[PDB]
Design a protein around this nucleic acid. Structure first.
Ligand SMILES: [Mg+2]
Ligand SMILES: [Mg+2]
Length: 654
DNA sequence: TGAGGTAGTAGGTTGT
RNA sequence: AACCUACUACCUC
């Protein structure tokens, strides 16, 4: 179903590696005394750096392209606790191969260090590792903004360097937190320090003198207040006092037009190829297949979900809606009422607008009003209220949920002419009611696509999932599960997966024959182990896809305009998805399953249009994943405890 | 809290 | 190192 273009992405192919580069030098170290059970990630990776040149680790040890006699062999360094002192013994040199994948990998980590530690010693340059800043874009009175690009280096599998370039900006202050704060700037965003690498937030400055452990008496007695003296008190978190004498502050606040972005990518590329003796940049061109427009369906074919409000829903049902007005007045604003009635006029079944005549200030009594409403058929409520505060906003959302009443907030100074804004709140509201706004008129390989994301919170996270009961279907979610970190427990994945499988059984009378499994970001090794054995055993087929928002790189046209819904395959098992300042395609990886890439690229992009509450825009990632991101965020944000009596056909979190 | 997004500054989980 | 987030600001319908 595709028509080819040819784009080239922001990579460049530079000179092939030469003999000496195809056979690095190995060296064994001395740990005196030996490290610890975790103290090897900065302590093996602090000696591989202390050596100099292009020294970069080789698993349990180090490697170089530099002769070991120009290595610094005998030195002394430490992480806090054990003060080590390294010494380097050799092991000779052994060849490596590009065609072979196993060697191509270590060479890159050398090539990265080559890049990195050949960038340190350049001239009119500012280097933050892989990042290079080449020009001045703005110089302010103690407010410098250097701006070049971020880089990377690796090998091609034919033995030739590759160089990814992408234009960045950096911001660096010159003054103290007083030599600057007494020049105009208000209270700081974050007080970064030079005494350590440590920082803190910024509350409000203490009115009193730190002269009364000891607040001020310890500084000028710790030899910490010599070179620059403390000025006034500081107040932040992990109340605590700090003498604001020495602290090269970290400051926060234009985005470059797409054309200039490619121009600078190519220019900076040349520069780094020629200055670093790596040759002429021959920008890598990949071919990119144009993907087929999906046919999203309300009552009838429509281009953006918000058109369902004028045309009719894909599956409506006998429904009722409540209204909470927290501002002054009382009425459903006619146009919102007229707006709804016409969308249900367009659709098949009937509507009822109710009105909550209760304020939460009534306390417990206000719940009674809710008890009555739900009872009398109310499904979700639209709330009109002046911009609320996060803490109040959450307490209320969760109150209604505790009565099984999803809430859509519309911020109050509203005018008819404010049209898109209220139009989205309405879709949001119906999504929260249970309505199947739009769906996909299509022939797809996976009849069910589930999204997995994780975590909304602090110390612990929630692993959760959302469904689309596919080839248009119902969107529904599942009760999440509290977990330690980002990795969703192996059994929890399967448990969630099954609950999503069973959902399909209830709507189709049949288990699926193919499911689509989508993770947010990288899949931790083996976190889909179970589900996949589990599926295979039940003889239901599948594909697993890592879906990365970051890392897609850039994609540029050779000439013309890159068009919406473009698909570029890269390496085996991996492809980009430009769904159109400068766009950022999704990096996607087929981790498991036997479906051809184009076909997945197809669903994914098509699954993109499904999301019911975007109205006019389309989210960058597939409706299940987005839902998963949204659900999981919201649960973490206001607790799992409120969800019990909330029907999971109702997307309360949009 | 209308929603989508890119661009700076942070940090953290995975996992070497 | 590869990916998530959180703030900020700006754009778009
Ligand atoms: Mg919403
Ligand atoms: Mg995530």
């Amino acid at each position: 179903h595709l028509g080819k273009t040819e784009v080239f992405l922001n990579r460049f192919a530079l000179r092939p590696l030469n003999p000496e580069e195809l056979r690095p030098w190995r060296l064994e170290v001395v740990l005196d005394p030996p490290p610890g059970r975790e103290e090897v990630y900065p302590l093996l990776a602090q000696v591989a750096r202390r050596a100099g040149g292009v020294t970069v680790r080789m698993g349990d040890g180090l490697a170089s392209w530099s002769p070991p006699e120009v290595l610094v062999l005998e030195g002394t360094l430490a992480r806090m606790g054990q003060t080590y002192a390294y010494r380097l013994y050799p092991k000779g040199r052994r060849p490596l191969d590009p065609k072979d994948p196993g060697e191509r990998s270590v060479l890159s980590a050398l090539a990265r260090r080559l890049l990195q530690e050949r960038l340190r010693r350049l001239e009119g340059v500012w280097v933050e590792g892989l990042a290079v800043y080449r020009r001045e874009h703005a110089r302010g009175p103690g407010w410098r903004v250097l701006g070049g690009a971020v880089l990377d280096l690796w090998v091609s599998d034919s033995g030739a360097f590759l160089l990814e370039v992408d234009p960045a900006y950096r911001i660096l202050c010159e003054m103290s937190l007083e030599a600057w704060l007494a020049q105009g700037h208000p209270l700081p965003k974050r007080v970064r320090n030079a005494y350590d690498r440590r920082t803190w937030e910024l509350l409000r400055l203490g009115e009193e003198d730190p002269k009364e452990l000891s607040l001020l008496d310890y500084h000028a007695s710790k030899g910490r207040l010599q070179g620059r003296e403390g000025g006034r008190v500081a107040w932040v978190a992990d109340p605590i006092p700090h003498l604001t004498g020495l602290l090269v502050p970290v400051l926060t606040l234009l985005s470059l037009p797409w054309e200039e972005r490619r121009r600078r990518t190519r220019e900076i590329a040349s520069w780094i190829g020629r200055r670093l003796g790596l040759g002429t940049p021959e920008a890598v061109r990949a071919q990119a297949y144009r993907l087929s427009i999906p046919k999203l369906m309300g009552r009838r074919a429509v281009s953006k979900p918000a058109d369902a409000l004028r045309v009719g829903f894909y599956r409506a049902q006998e429904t009722a809606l409540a209204l909470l007005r927290l501002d002054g007045a009382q009425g459903w604003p006619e146009f919102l009422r007229r707006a709804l009635l016409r969308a249900f006029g367009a659709s098949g079944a009937s509507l009822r607008l109710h009105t909550l005549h209760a304020h939460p200030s009534q306390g417990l009594a206000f719940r009674e009003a809710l008890r009555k409403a739900k009872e009398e058929g109310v499904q979700a409520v639209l709330v009109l209220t002046p911009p609320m505060a996060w803490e109040d906003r959450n307490r209320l959302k969760a109150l209604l949920l505790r009565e099984g009443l999803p809430s859509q907030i519309l911020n109050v100074p509203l005018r008819e002419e404010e049209r898109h804004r209220w139009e989205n709140a309405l879709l949001g509201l119906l999504a929260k009611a249970g309505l199947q706004v739009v769906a996909l008129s299509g022939a797809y390989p996976a009849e069910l696509a589930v999204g997995f994301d994780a975590g909304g919170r602090e110390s612990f996270r929630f692993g959760g999932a959302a469904c689309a009961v596919g080839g248009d279907g119902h969107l529904l979610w599942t009760l999440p599960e509290a977990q330690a970190g980002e990795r969703i427990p192996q059994e929890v994945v399967w448990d969630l997966l099954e609950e999503t499988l069973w959902a399909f059984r209830r709507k189709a009378g049949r288990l699926p024959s193919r499911v689509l499994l989508l993770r947010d970001g990288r899949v931790p090794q083996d976190e889909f182990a179970l589900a996949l054995e589990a599926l295979a055993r039940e003889g239901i087929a599948y594909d697993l896809v890592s879906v990365r928002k970051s890392g897609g790189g850039r994609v540029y046209p050779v000439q013309g305009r890159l068009a919406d819904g473009l698909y570029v395959p890269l390496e085996d098992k991996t492809f980009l998805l430009l769904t159109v300042g400068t766009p950022r395609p999704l990096k996607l990886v087929h981790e498991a399953g036997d479906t051809p890439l184009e076909a997945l690229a197809h669903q994914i992009f098509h699954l993109t249009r499904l999301y019911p509450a975007s109205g006019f825009a389309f989210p960058r990632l597939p409706a299940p994943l987005h839902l998963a991101d949204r659900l999981v965020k919201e649960v973490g944000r206001l607790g799992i405890r409120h969800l019990k009596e909330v029907d999971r056909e109702k997307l309360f979190f949009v």
